[PDB]
Design a protein around this motif. Structure first.
Motif: not given
Ligand code: HEC
Length: 103
Positions: A9-24
């Motif tokens: 869900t994140f990849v489909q709807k959020c990834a275009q505007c957000h990263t989650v990793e440390n130092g992202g």
């Protein structure tokens, strides 16, 4: 929730505007590392709207579940232009993934 389902869900709807990793890197929206237990608008180096910074609440399961259902309703004036995840189950799985991926 189901972390695996939340990730897709994140990849489909959020990834275009957000990263989650440390130092992202910050994209359209702020990197989400360390989101849980932190107040709104606290990602280092990101230029939030006054609204996101002033909300004043702490991000956790209950606040994220409400926010993600209708972003603009929870934070009027926010520059996050996304309608929200309407289904509760889908939203819960996403929150589960968020909690696992941001720490
Ligand atoms: C771009 C078109 C976006 C999409 C799709 C999603 N988000 Fe986003 N988000 C975006 C911006 C530009 C901002 C900052 C808004 C502001 O007014 O400053 C945000 C912010 C968030 C936050 C708050 C972060 C914080 O307070 O530190 C969260 C929790 C967040 N966004 C989550 C999120 C999720 C899980 C998404 C997919 C369902 C999603 N966003 C999509 C821009 C965009």
């Amino acid at each position: 929730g189901d972390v695996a389902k939340g990730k897709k869900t994140f990849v489909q709807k959020c990834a275009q505007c957000h990263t989650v990793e440390n130092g992202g890197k910050h994209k359209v929206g702020p990197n989400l590392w360390g989101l849980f237990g932190r107040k709104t608008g606290q990602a280092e180096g990101y230029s939030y709207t006054d609204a996101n910074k002033s909300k004043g609440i702490v991000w956790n399961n209950d606040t994220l579940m409400e926010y993600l259902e209708n972003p603009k309703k929870y934070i009027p004036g926010t520059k996050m232009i996304f309608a929200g995840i309407k289904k509760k189950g889908e939203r819960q799985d996403l929150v589960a993934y968020l909690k696992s991926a941001t720490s």
